[PDB]
Symmetry: none
Subunit: 896 residues, 2 copies
């Protein structure tokens, strides 16, 4: 009674309390989960010594154990004016050698919109950050337009270079000197060019700079200050001054080599380079199906303090920083298999580092199961500000390839290191990175000269249509030519990648620039051939190219819907057997109506009863496909049977309403009597009208269509039609009798006109959304279309197609897409408009495979600037984002 | 026996608490516990800066003749190539001055040491001093260093003059600058140098606040520096049409036509609130929230952006969980640019339009109108200004606002420029403000700052690294003691002994009141030697000396034995709470005196004592418990040798005796009144001095503290000790032999010191009592402590004031002994 109530209340009380407890718990779990969340590395790019211009090239170098160290290039400074190995020499450099980039003056100024004036005072550090970041983003398969105006963070390890001090020597200070040389402007320019609004900073902690930026980026992402982050470092060797300071401070090896862990370690070698990585919180990278290269688990940064010299390393400081980083990501020391050491190859540094590693991993590691150590420094030198980014990248590649690369110069193990009491092993050979199921974890160390130490822990990453359309584009013809070349080498080197996947990635994950190319292909070999054909200039079907003018807009597009005489057996069968947007429309029709499908596509006809509603559906199905790919008509029109589908598209009817009407007239005109003929006459509408008058046949013969200025279709009684044709032939006027059933748009259509006006009366008429050109008028349809009168008058009146075309031409239309099984209206269309005017595109065409016609037309719309829904175009297929070529920068020399 | 609902509501209460606690620490206010600066207008302290701001002083001046020749770079023509638009700027009074020895920088190292590094060291040192951080708590600690700093021209002018040196690196690299702060201050937490242009100082703050909230560090140094070393930058900025030809930031005025370059340095000390309160630190203000962002691609690279500024202010408010309505003041980025000023006010209006009214408006101003655009250090000046505004509960005027800018829709923007020094009137509610800084290249920052929550005998210790600095330090205390008579000497002493580094040149002053201290310091500056004033220059790297504790025996006792210490000193009371009475009584008093000396950081290197004194030296050594230790015929004094008296005992055949050997001509004879009286009469007949009052004839664990035996007279049973003589003279010679020079006597009378001086060479050693009958118990103890401090003994000054209500007060900062270094 009321006992039910006190018990109902008690259940509802608990119910609420459990709901509140669940939600409170969830709220706190989210906070904890977020705080220790791995940060997915989703893209990387670099410029390192030894001609390294990508992670693939860095890995080959690392894999093959190549010494990238060379003599100071004559073009940087004359090493002959500074080299002196004598430790007592004043104002001299200890070494002849360094780790240098292949070029530093080269930059694609127009790509980034930097005027040639501005580039003269632009720090080569900024030039490299722009190229590298762009590529890091491309490689992460993000589109900079969809990245534009976003909450993305920029965290760069960057110090001032000597560029400005080389300008101050020759010229008078200019306004660009500031933006061109400030490290704050360097990072600022990335946010400016890529349109990034998140946190932005330039850090400088010497050798740990690159790793401090990572820590800060990971802080930002966990704290939800951004959703994407660029993290990197730069370091350039522009003047010998810094090399004199480092030689005088006794930091540099007279051998010009980092002989890390070797008995002969006697300082480091100065290298230069640039590395940028793209970061997301792991959950966001899993949600977006990004390829995770590796994950950053934990980071720590600390200081040596008063414990020892300002420029001398400190073992307890290094121990605290590794331990804090392991603590920050919840990694146990036992989980770690590899360390990419700071390993600068100094006499006192090597023992302090290995000793600090021995302190951290001593209880977790054994001499039989040791920790592996090594450094990129033995290949490319010490990149100082950019060391750490190079270290991280090496570790990431090692994780990708499941191999540990060899560390160079390790001949005599250092006697000052107690090898027998430290479970440490120097990687001397390229070896499989073995594990026992256990996920591969590594550490990267960077110990700054002024005592600012940093450490990072990185774990291994977790765990139909047979005709294709490829789009390529660059900001310049030269750049597109270089891009096409990239693809030819790319396709020859990676034949294991699916053309479906390559195409999908290029269309969806790459920028659509003004110098474009569209290629239709069914297999990799065909694609390869067509790219070669285009390069040689061999004008071949399925390959379209154009340079759109700068700041150009998508043109207006006219949709022309086909008429009665267009049908054939199995028309667009392939799209039914292969295209879901088309099928969800063609089957939806079939439900309204033997079956539409058995008539259209039999197991194994031209009669108006079938003929009329079929085309409507087929055209609605084709229109459903085109809008799915992002095509939206600016005006519509159709030859009688096609004005039905043109009207449903603009709103006038529902698929059901419109398809009921077309099935009605089809069934109606079929039961109508014989003796009905239609003739195609090559003569003006006036010439035919004067002959109708002359022969007194005006009440027995009608003009069915005006399709051209000298191309008209006559309709009426068999004898009368034959009489006018015979007379027209007598006048040398060409005539063609149509394989028609009944005399359409002729007086003979009067009996049915009431039984069909009955059907039209039982229909709701909604106003049109898109512009429609009337068949009855040859002008823009007004409010006239609303009343079922317009549709009854439609059967009786001649089809003014010629005027419909001139209307479109007067409105400035030059792009026409035919939605139908044959390019009929295109042929008639080309005849109405002046020669060579407009672009005419079919949907279906006999002799051309359905997908082949649809894609050749799509590529041609993409040449006009029509924004294609490329996501939409590959939605119903099993596509995966793959690695594809990055942008081919058109480099030019800027200095002085 | 709980129902499902009861259990759930219990589990729910806990879950809610766990969530509230976590959410609280994530948005925890960060306390500002000290600041220092060097700003234009001779500003060298937050106090001098507040006078500049208070009195609406304009600190702009022409470029100093010793910086660069302005006449060679100035051209009025705004079409002039390679010239400076103005001849003015906000300059520092001196930039070449630095106390290199204080910092341990050689003169060769200082020649190439970037002035930015010089200011950073001085400024950080003062910030920590003002925050009253205990030296031992700062050295070898998890403290972060977050500084806004970009490279200066210093090395460019070095390169024109010499061959590159090793020092050029560490003397000019911005990482080296922040690195050195950690090196000198002994800091092990995160360290970084940020460069985001005009927003660097605010970005460094945000980073520091994050680090503190993330528990990466427990204290942090945050700030920035900017210096105008060469004309080159001023040329670039003039060519870029950024600089006012008037040489003034006419913020919000109609004539606004650019900014004026300034220079300066600011460092602030940060702590999470819960820690600042727990440690009783003086909270100047709290940092509620911070946010850093970018313009992106919206406007031009060097042009500001309103929407970016709206996003950043809103983020800083959200981050701190602050309602826009709570904000009463904004320290505007306001650089005085033509397009910048409308954008800025527009953006303020957008964030605060629906919360502020024309009747009740938001107040805006900028320190740039007083000192110029300090650029990298711009954010630190703005913050310091707002902090000073919250402290003094007033809004300082903003200069050059004559004609309100017609491009600003003042009639719709509920924004008001501060024109006069006004009382910061809040309607009961807490005072909250925000500081904006928008970097020239788009990096924006905004910070939200809120008002801060809510025995009579003394020993002052003063110290400096040099004699000149200690006099300068004493001089500053003299001036300070006059200007603030409102300050209790107890608190002044407390702060100076606990919150200041103890250096080589030192001074100890015992005084009972403010008047006594002022006078004694005046007497010291004259050289008028008076009791209770100690002074010494301890040598460079001189360790704490060996202290030998001496405990008295029978005879020293009196009726009012340490009564002043029994009542006023609680450590003495704790330990406390005729031969049958006096023997454990002297032990009782010597235990209480020792415990009290030990609570001041005193620990002996050796222990010993006369008769009862040996038993008390034993408990101290740890040879037996206090519980175990305490639980347990005429004598004549002879003025003759131990040998000279023993030969007479054989001659008179009186053998069956010497009680104690207190010297080579001072011995004690024990025996029967007839036997001893016969010696005394014979010894007086031989012309040997003799006197006497004793009502009788006298004479577990291992030791952790070295002990000199009375029996052996050397290092080291209790039954034999009673029989055998007390070899005091032998015990003193071994102390002398083992290099002992510092002697502390624990007892009621300084008996053993007089006895000890007679056993050692002329003027050798320092002799210290505990109690002296004529002298007051506090006076004798404090004068002895002052002498232990002079010797180098690490005194536990916090234990010295542990039982008295002592509060940290604003005390003076180090007088840097400046010298000129350049090239
Ligand atoms: Ca160090
Ligand atoms: Ca901007």
């Amino acid at each position: 009674l009321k006992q039910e109530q006190e018990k109902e209340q008690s259940l509802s009380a608990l119910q609420r309390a459990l709901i509140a407890l669940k939600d409170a718990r969830s709220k706190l779990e989210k906070y904890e989960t977020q705080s220790k969340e791995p940060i997915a590395i989703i893209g990387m790019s670099c410029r390192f010594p030894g001609g390294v211009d990508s992670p693939e090239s860095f890995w080959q170098l690392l894999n093959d154990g190549v010494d990238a160290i060379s003599e100071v290039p004559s073009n940087r400074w004359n090493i002959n004016n500074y080299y002196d190995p004598d430790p007592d020499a004043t104002g001299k450099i200890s070494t002849r050698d360094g780790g240098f980039l292949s070029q530093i003056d080269g930059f694609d100024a127009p790509f980034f919109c930097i005027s040639p004036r501005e580039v003269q005072s632009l720090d080569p550090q900024q030039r490299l950050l722009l190229e590298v970041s762009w590529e890091a983003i491309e490689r992460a398969n993000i589109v900079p337009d969809q990245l534009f105006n976003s909450l993305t963070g920029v965290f760069i390890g960057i110090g001032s270079s000597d560029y400005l001090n080389q300008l101050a020597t020759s010229e008078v200070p200019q306004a660009y000197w500031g933006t061109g040389n400030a490290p704050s402007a360097a990072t600022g320019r990335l946010s400016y060019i890529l349109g990034l609004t998140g946190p932005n900073l330039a850090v400088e902690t010497a050798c740990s700079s690159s790793l401090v930026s990572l820590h800060l980026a990971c802080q930002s992402l966990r704290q939800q200050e951004c959703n994407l982050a660029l993290a990197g470092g730069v370091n350039l060797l522009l003047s010998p001054e810094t090399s004199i300071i480092f030689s005088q401070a006794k930091m540099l090896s007279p051998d010009g080599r980092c002989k890390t862990f070797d008995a002969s370690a006697n300082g480091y070698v100065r290298g230069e380079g640039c590395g940028v990585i793209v970061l997301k919180r792991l959950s966001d990278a899993v949600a977006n199906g990004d390829n995770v290269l590796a994950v950053i688990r934990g980071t720590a940064i600390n200081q040596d303090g008063a414990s020892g010299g300002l420029t001398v390393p400190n073992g307890p400081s290094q121990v605290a920083v590794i331990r804090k980083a392991l603590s920050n990501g919840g990694v146990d020391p036992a989980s770690v298999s590899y360390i990419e050491a700071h390993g600068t190859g100094t006499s006192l540094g090597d023992p302090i580092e290995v000793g600090a590693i021995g302190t951290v991993f001593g209880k977790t590691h054994s001499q039989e199961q040791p920790l592996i150590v090594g450094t990129a420094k033995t290949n490319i030198g010490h990149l100082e500000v950019a060391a750490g980014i190079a270290g991280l990248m090496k570790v990431v590649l090692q994780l990708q390839h499941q191999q540990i690369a060899p560390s160079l110069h390790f001949k005599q193990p250092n006697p000052y290191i107690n090898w027998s009491q430290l479970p440490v092993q120097v990687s001397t050979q390229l070896t499989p990175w073995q594990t026992n199921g256990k996920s591969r974890i590594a550490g990267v160390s960077s110990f700054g000269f002024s005592g600012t130490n940093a450490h990072v822990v990185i774990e291994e990453a977790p765990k139909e249509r047979a005709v294709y359309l490829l789009t390529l584009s660059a900001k310049t013809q030269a750049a597109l030519d270089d891009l096409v070349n990239s693809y030819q080498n790319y396709l020859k080197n990676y034949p294991e990648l699916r053309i479906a996947d390559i195409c999908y990635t290029a269309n969806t994950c790459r920028s659509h620039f003004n110098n474009r190319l569209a290629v239709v292909a069914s297999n990799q070999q065909e694609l390869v051939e067509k790219l070669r054909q285009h390069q040689q200039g061999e004008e071949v079907t399925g390959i379209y190219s154009i340079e759109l003018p700068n700041n150009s807009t998508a043109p207006k597009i006219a949709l022309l819907f086909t008429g009665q005489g267009s049908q054939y057996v199995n028309m667009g069968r392939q799209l039914y057997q292969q295209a879901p947007v088309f099928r969800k429309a063609l089957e939806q029709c079939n439900e309204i109506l033997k079956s539409l499908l058995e008539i259209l596509y039999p197991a194994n006809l031209d009669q108006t009863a079938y003929t009329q509603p079929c085309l409507f559906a087929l055209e609605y199905a084709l229109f459903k496909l085109w809008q799915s790919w992002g095509i939206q008509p600016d005006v519509v029109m159709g030859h009688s049977v096609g004005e039905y589908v043109a009207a449903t598209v603009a709103g006038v009817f529902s698929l059901e309403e419109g398809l009921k009407l077309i099935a009605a007239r089809g069934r109606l005109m079929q039961q109508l009597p014989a003796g009905g003929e239609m003739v195609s006459v090559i003569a003006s509408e006036s010439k035919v009208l004067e002959i109708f008058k002359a022969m007194s046949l005006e009440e027995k013969v009608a003009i069915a269509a005006i399709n051209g200025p000298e191309s008209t279709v006559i309709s009426g009684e068999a004898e009368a039609v034959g009489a006018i044709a015979t007379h027209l032939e007598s006048l040398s006027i060409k005539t063609k009798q149509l394989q028609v059933s009944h005399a359409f748009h002729s007086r003979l259509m009067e009996p049915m006109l009431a039984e069909f006006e009955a059907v039209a009366k039982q229909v709701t008429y909604s106003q049109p959304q898109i512009s429609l050109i009337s068949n009855v008028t040859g002008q823009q349809v007004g409010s006239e279309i609303t009343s079922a009168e317009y549709w009854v008058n439609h059967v009786r009146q001649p089809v003014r197609f010629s005027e419909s075309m001139t209307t479109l031409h007067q409105e400035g239309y030059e792009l026409f897409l035919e939605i139908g099984p044959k390019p009929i209206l295109l042929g008639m269309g080309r005849q109405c408009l002046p020669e060579g005017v407009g672009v005419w595109l079919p949907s279906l065409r006999p002799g051309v495979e359905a997908w082949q016609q649809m894609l050749q037309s799509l590529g041609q719309l993409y040449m006009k600037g029509i924004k294609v829904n490329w996501s939409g175009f590959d939605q119903d297929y099993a596509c995966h984002k793959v690695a594809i070529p990055t942008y081919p920068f058109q480099r030019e020399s800027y200095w002085i």
